[PDB]
DNA sequence: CCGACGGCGCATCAGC
DNA sequence: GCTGATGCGC
DNA sequence: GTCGG
């Protein structure tokens, strides 16, 4: 990182916009910024540098000029200091608490982990179970014990169904060296953009996951999306392991590859690879690729059979997983 | 200069 | 009791 | 907040 300090800088100046002023726009805008000069081969020596990048613009190369001639930032230190906006931050990191509701909380004096807890009663169930493990939600997993959840969720999948394909995707497929949670997408011959619903897919996974006291709690549960918190096996009298925050997601078996690329990420790379995708006719989801019609009317779903066939049809130079954390 | 910047599954609950 | 509205997370 | 239109 050539030019951390600035990239630290231009993130914590997203999660405010994003936490406390609600201006996602504002908030994506920083975060652009940070990626492109995150790959910047460079040490930035002012803000006109940066302003060459795309994404870089007048009030980021200016706030640029002031954190090298100062090493600080002046607005981020009022926000830091500013009681209103330092809780809502602090709030918004409990997983179910989001910019409404920590505006709400703290309107209310409720600012505070004791706070939360005492007055428990108006949270809801996912904001409840993001108290109970705030630590352990902001601890990082180590590829190790990623490797080894791996393998139980393969394997506990297999035993429900042979069929079953289950693949770990984000940050992990990306082969970092930790992940903040783990997402699994998973599919099965019996379940395509046609089949007819084919009920408790999902569901029976789930269900044995939790049978062998993986899942330990559910966030959100539906057809096709699971959203929860698991745990590895404690060996017998050791330190329990931390809880972690698990996703997995059920997709038709014949958009598997695009499925593939949207949930292995990184979350900028697919900002940056739809965007793309526009600017060459196509338009691109989490379920296909289609062309644009010379009207706007999007063309039927195109054949996709590996990750790189879709960095063909926009003329992308292929991107192995670990270069598309952006 | 102004306005687009992605869109959706799931849970909750205000208004009836 | 129901549902349209909104939040949340990704 | 930024850039294309
Ligand atoms: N807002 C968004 N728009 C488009 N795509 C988005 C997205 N948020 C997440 N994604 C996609 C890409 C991530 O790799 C993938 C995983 O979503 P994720 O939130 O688990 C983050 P990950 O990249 O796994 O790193 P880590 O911090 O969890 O270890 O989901
Ligand atoms: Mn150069
Ligand atoms: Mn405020
Ligand atoms: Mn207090
Ligand atoms: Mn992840
Ligand atoms: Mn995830
Ligand atoms: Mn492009
Ligand atoms: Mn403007
Ligand atoms: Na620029
Ligand atoms: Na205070
Ligand atoms: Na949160
Ligand atoms: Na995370
Ligand atoms: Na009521
Ligand atoms: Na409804």
Redesign the pocket.
């Known amino acids: 990182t050539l030019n951390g300090g600035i990239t630290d800088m231009l993130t914590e ?1 997203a999660n405010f ?1 994003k936490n406390v002023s609600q ?4 908030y ?3 975060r ?2 940070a990626s492109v000069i995150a790959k910047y081969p460079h040490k930035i020596k002012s803000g006109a540098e940066a ?1 060459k ?11 640029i000029d002031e954190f090298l001639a100062t090493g600080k930032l002046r607005k981020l230190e009022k926000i830091r200091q500013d009681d209103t906006s330092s809780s809502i931050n602090f709030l ?1 990191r ?9 505006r ?1 909380f703290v309107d209310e004096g409720i600012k505070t982990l004791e706070d939360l807890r005492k007055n428990e009663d ?1 949270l ?3 904001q409840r179970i ?1 108290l109970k493990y705030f630590g352990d939600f902001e601890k990082r997993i180590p590829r190790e014990e990623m490797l080894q959840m791996q393998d139980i969720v393969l394997n506990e999948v297999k035993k429900v169904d042979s069929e079953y394909i289950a693949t770990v995707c ?1 940050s992990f497929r990306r082969g970092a060296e930790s992940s ?2 783990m ?1 699994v997408l998973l599919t099965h011959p019996s379940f395509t953009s046609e089949s007819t619903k084919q009920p408790k897919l ?1 569901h029976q996974v789930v269900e044995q996951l939790q049978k062998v006291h993986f899942i330990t709690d ?10 929860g918190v698991c745990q590895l096996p404690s060996k017998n009298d050791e330190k329990e392991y931390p809880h972690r ?1 698990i ?1 997995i997601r059920l997709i038709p078996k014949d958009q598997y590859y695009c499925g593939v690329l ?2 292995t ?1 990184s ?1 900028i790379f ?2 940056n690879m ?2 793309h995708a ?1 600017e060459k006719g196509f338009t691109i ?2 379920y296909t690729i289609r062309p644009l019609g010379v009207t706007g009317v999007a063309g039927e779903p195109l054949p996709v059979d590996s990750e790189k066939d879709i960095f063909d049809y926009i003329q992308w130079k292929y991107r192995e997983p670990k270069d598309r954390s952006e």
């Open positions: 100046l916009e201006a996602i726009h504002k994506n805008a920083y652009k910024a302003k990048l795309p994404g870089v613009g007048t009030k980021i190369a200016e706030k918004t409990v997983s179910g608490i989001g910019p409404s509701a920590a709400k108006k809801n169930h996912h993001g984000g903040g949670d997402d999902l559910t966030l959100s549960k539906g057809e096709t999306k699971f959203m925050r996703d949207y949930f990420g979350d697919n900002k739809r965007a526009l989801n989490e």
